[PDB]
Design an enzyme around this catalytic site. Structure first.
Site, PDB file in Angstrom:
ATOM      1  N   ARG A  10       0.823  -1.207   0.000  1.00 53.02           N
ATOM      2  CA  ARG A  10       0.000   0.000   0.000  1.00 53.02           C
ATOM      3  C   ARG A  10       0.856   1.255   0.000  1.00 53.02           C
ATOM      4  NH1 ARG A  10      -3.321   2.662   4.700  1.00 53.02           N
ATOM      5  NH2 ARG A  10      -4.888   3.830   3.510  1.00 53.02           N
TER       6      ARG A  10
ATOM      7  N   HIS B 273       0.501   4.454  -2.494  1.00 58.76           N
ATOM      8  CA  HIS B 273       0.362   5.836  -2.070  1.00 58.76           C
ATOM      9  C   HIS B 273       1.522   6.690  -2.522  1.00 58.76           C
ATOM     10  CE1 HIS B 273      -3.153   5.669   0.871  1.00 58.76           C
ATOM     11  NE2 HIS B 273      -3.174   4.577   0.134  1.00 58.76           N
TER      12      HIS B 273
ATOM     13  N   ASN C 237      -3.774   9.296   4.427  1.00 62.65           N
ATOM     14  CA  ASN C 237      -2.547   8.709   4.935  1.00 62.65           C
ATOM     15  C   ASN C 237      -2.436   8.725   6.444  1.00 62.65           C
ATOM     16  OD1 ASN C 237      -1.697   8.241   2.324  1.00 62.65           O
ATOM     17  ND2 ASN C 237      -0.678  10.216   2.136  1.00 62.65           N
TER      18      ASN C 237
ATOM     19  N   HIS D 173      -6.473  -5.902  -1.843  1.00 56.16           N
ATOM     20  CA  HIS D 173      -7.194  -6.080  -0.590  1.00 56.16           C
ATOM     21  C   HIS D 173      -7.400  -7.541  -0.227  1.00 56.16           C
ATOM     22  CE1 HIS D 173      -8.930  -1.727  -0.882  1.00 56.16           C
ATOM     23  NE2 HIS D 173      -7.640  -1.758  -0.624  1.00 56.16           N
TER      24      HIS D 173
HETATM   25  C1  HEM Z   1      -9.517   1.246  -5.550  1.00 57.95           C
HETATM   26  C2  HEM Z   1      -9.615   2.171  -4.587  1.00 57.95           C
HETATM   27  C3  HEM Z   1      -9.042   1.895  -3.176  1.00 57.95           C
HETATM   28  C4  HEM Z   1      -9.562   2.339  -2.029  1.00 57.95           C
HETATM   29  C5  HEM Z   1     -10.854   3.153  -1.848  1.00 57.95           C
HETATM   30  C6  HEM Z   1      -8.733   1.860  -0.947  1.00 57.95           C
HETATM   31  C7  HEM Z   1      -8.938   2.100   0.383  1.00 57.95           C
HETATM   32  C8  HEM Z   1      -8.312   1.457   1.416  1.00 57.95           C
HETATM   33  C9  HEM Z   1      -8.594   1.648   2.813  1.00 57.95           C
HETATM   34  C10 HEM Z   1      -9.652   2.605   3.395  1.00 57.95           C
HETATM   35  C11 HEM Z   1      -7.799   0.841   3.507  1.00 57.95           C
HETATM   36  C12 HEM Z   1      -7.759   0.708   5.037  1.00 57.95           C
HETATM   37  C13 HEM Z   1      -6.800   1.733   5.622  1.00 57.95           C
HETATM   38  C14 HEM Z   1      -7.007   1.880   7.098  1.00 57.95           C
HETATM   39  O1  HEM Z   1      -8.136   1.652   7.575  1.00 57.95           O
HETATM   40  O2  HEM Z   1      -6.035   2.280   7.797  1.00 57.95           O
HETATM   41  C15 HEM Z   1      -6.978   0.114   2.572  1.00 57.95           C
HETATM   42  C16 HEM Z   1      -6.009  -0.821   2.880  1.00 57.95           C
HETATM   43  C17 HEM Z   1      -5.161  -1.401   1.957  1.00 57.95           C
HETATM   44  N1  HEM Z   1      -5.079  -1.068   0.604  1.00 57.95           N
HETATM   45 FE1  HEM Z   1      -6.425  -0.026  -0.444  1.00 57.95          FE
HETATM   46  N2  HEM Z   1      -7.687   1.143  -1.473  1.00 57.95           N
HETATM   47  C18 HEM Z   1      -7.834   1.161  -2.844  1.00 57.95           C
HETATM   48  C19 HEM Z   1      -6.958   0.595  -3.728  1.00 57.95           C
HETATM   49  C20 HEM Z   1      -5.787  -0.047  -3.408  1.00 57.95           C
HETATM   50  C21 HEM Z   1      -4.696  -0.361  -4.310  1.00 57.95           C
HETATM   51  C22 HEM Z   1      -4.687   0.062  -5.787  1.00 57.95           C
HETATM   52  C23 HEM Z   1      -3.758  -1.001  -3.612  1.00 57.95           C
HETATM   53  C24 HEM Z   1      -2.391  -1.575  -4.035  1.00 57.95           C
HETATM   54  C25 HEM Z   1      -2.143  -1.995  -5.273  1.00 57.95           C
HETATM   55  C26 HEM Z   1      -4.251  -1.116  -2.257  1.00 57.95           C
HETATM   56  C27 HEM Z   1      -3.655  -1.784  -1.233  1.00 57.95           C
HETATM   57  C28 HEM Z   1      -4.084  -1.843   0.062  1.00 57.95           C
HETATM   58  C29 HEM Z   1      -3.577  -2.723   1.076  1.00 57.95           C
HETATM   59  C30 HEM Z   1      -2.477  -3.761   0.826  1.00 57.95           C
HETATM   60  C31 HEM Z   1      -4.203  -2.445   2.230  1.00 57.95           C
HETATM   61  C32 HEM Z   1      -3.946  -3.099   3.603  1.00 57.95           C
HETATM   62  C33 HEM Z   1      -2.803  -2.299   4.254  1.00 57.95           C
HETATM   63  C34 HEM Z   1      -2.396  -2.746   5.637  1.00 57.95           C
HETATM   64  O3  HEM Z   1      -2.921  -3.740   6.175  1.00 57.95           O
HETATM   65  O4  HEM Z   1      -1.517  -2.063   6.241  1.00 57.95           O
HETATM   66  N3  HEM Z   1      -5.469  -0.522  -2.159  1.00 57.95           N
HETATM   67  N4  HEM Z   1      -7.300   0.527   1.293  1.00 57.95           N
HETATM   68 CA   LIG Z   2       4.826  10.077  -4.882  1.00 64.06          CA
END
Ligand code: HEM
Ligand SMILES: [Ca+2]
Ligand SMILES: [Ca+2]
Length: 291
Positions: free
Chosen positions: A38, A42, A68, A167
């Site tokens: 992630r 970002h 962030n 995810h």
């Molecule tokens: C498509 C739109 C996306 C939205 C709206 C979104 C939103 C989110 C949100 C809200 C979280 C939880 C963060 C938290 O509660 O602290 C999350 C976690 C995560 N996102 Fe996304 N995300 C998106 C796309 C992506 C993409 C493109 C990637 C990587 C290629 C990604 C990888 C991750 C990962 C791996 C996590 C878990 C991180 C952890 O456990 O530390 N996400 N995302």
């Molecule tokens: Ca950058």
């Protein structure tokens, strides 16, 4: 200008040093692999894959933007890797490249596909909280806004569906999915289980797995969740919702290899966003500050 062999003479042991450290970090905490993936997203979605997200000196600020703050993690792992590489080849390997390699190595460590990471990115001397707010999609976005946000990075709807499969690993905080608990397109038994650890008010930081099926395994279970209305985020379930993306979700649920190959295709595109190359930017000595 990016090349997979960029360090083959200037820092021969960079990639293997990164691999060993990422494998150890993921073995210590599997979630860290998701966090590093992630972090690279970002980075790349905000003025390119230029390590701008890592700055926290007076040139930083992205870490305080809404998408962030209190959410991104793995900064210390990246710093620890950077110091190892600096000890091997001073001021040679960019933080931006370390993030990209760490993301790929993390996916592989959690059972996901490998791909070839082009290298040669350089590190920015500034950051953009403003662009972080405008360019990173929040979970309350509907499909049309998700498509637009990805299209602004020249990623098409298939890339959106495939990259959302990230995810399949990692966790989210209650404050980011509590809205979906109450929405019409969530399975009621699943919603009740989420409510048990995510109140309507308070408990903002309580965690739940993004993929209830295999939270620490990079696989296509993310998509089978969606087909059963067990997506965690509003934006996850938007992909299977009588929508233009439904047929791709069904394909990825039925064809894990179609998912993984679409995922690597999209990750390579993402990692190619707006790099600084050549003499642009710098090689940071410490990822958190400008030289
Ligand atoms: C498509 C739109 C996306 C939205 C709206 C979104 C939103 C989110 C949100 C809200 C979280 C939880 C963060 C938290 O509660 O602290 C999350 C976690 C995560 N996102 Fe996304 N995300 C998106 C796309 C992506 C993409 C493109 C990637 C990587 C290629 C990604 C990888 C991750 C990962 C791996 C996590 C878990 C991180 C952890 O456990 O530390 N996400 N995302
Ligand atoms: Ca950058
Ligand atoms: Ca999974």
């Amino acid at each position: 200008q990016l090349s997979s062999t960029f360090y083959d003479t200037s820092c021969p042991n960079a990639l293997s040093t990164i691999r060993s450290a990422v494998n150890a970090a993921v073995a210590q905490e599997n979630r860290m692999g998701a966090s590093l993936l992630r972090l690279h997203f970002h980075d790349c979605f905000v003025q390119g894959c230029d390590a701008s997200v890592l700055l926290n000196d007076t040139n930083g600020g992205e870490q305080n933007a809404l998408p962030n703050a209190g959410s991104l993690r793995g900064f210390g792992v990246i710093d620890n890797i950077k110091a190892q590489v600096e000890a091997l080849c001073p001021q040679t390997v960019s933080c931006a490249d370390i993030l990209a390699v760490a993301a790929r190595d993390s996916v592989v460590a959690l059972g996901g596909p490998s791909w070839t990471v082009p290298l040669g990115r350089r590190d920015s001397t500034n950051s953009s909280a403003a662009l972080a707010n405008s360019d990173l999609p929040p979970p309350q976005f509907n499909l049309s806004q998700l498509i637009t946000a990805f299209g602004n990075k020249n990623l098409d709807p298939t890339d959106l569906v495939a990259l959302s499969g990230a995810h399949t690993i990692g966790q989210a905080q209650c404050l980011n999915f509590r809205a979906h608990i109450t929405e019409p397109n969530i399975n009621p038994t699943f919603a009740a289980s989420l409510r048990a650890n995510c109140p309507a008010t308070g408990g903002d930081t309580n965690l739940a797995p993004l993929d209830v099926t295999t939270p620490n395994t990079f696989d296509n279970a993310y998509y089978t969740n969606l087909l059963n209305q067990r997506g965690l985020l509003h934006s996850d379930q938007e992909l299977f919702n009588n929508a233009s993306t439904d047929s791709t979700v069904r394909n990825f649920a039925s064809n894990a290899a179609a998912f993984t190959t679409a995922f690597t295709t999209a990750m390579i595109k993402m990692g190619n966003l707006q790099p600084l190359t050549g003499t642009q930017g710098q090689i940071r000595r410490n990822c958190w500050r400008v030289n």
